């Protein structure tokens, strides 16, 4: 799955840059990530870590 992980951060993270997401994604959350519309779109999660891809339905 791919999208924005939300749980511990609560409401998203306002990534400024792709690297700023990716470094945070790949370390734990996902296999990678990039910064989409100022939200860390993390890429390749385990299924337990639900994500959104629904254009900031979470209160980012």
Curated annotation (Swiss-Prot):
Listed Pfam families: Toxin_3 (PF00537)
Expression tissues: Expressed by the venom gland.
Positions of disulphide bridges: 11-59, 15-35, 21-40, 25-42
Domain of life of the source: Eukaryota
CDD domains: neurotoxins_LC_scorpion
Any one GO BP annotation for this protein: defense response
Major location (coarse): secreted
Keywords associated with the record: Disulfide bond, Ion channel impairing toxin, Neurotoxin, Secreted, Toxin, Voltage-gated sodium channel impairing toxin
Keyword Secreted: yes
Domain LCN-type CS-alpha/beta: residue ranges: 1-59
One GO CC term on file: extracellular region
PROSITE patterns documented for this protein: LCN_CSAB
Job of this protein: Binds voltage-independently sodium channels (Nav) and inhibits the inactivation of the activated channels, thereby blocking neuronal transmission. Is highly toxic to insects and barely toxic to mammals. As it does not compete with the classical alpha-toxin AaH2, this toxin is considered as an alpha-like toxin.
Record's protein name: Alpha-like toxin CsEv5
Organism: Centruroides sculpturatus
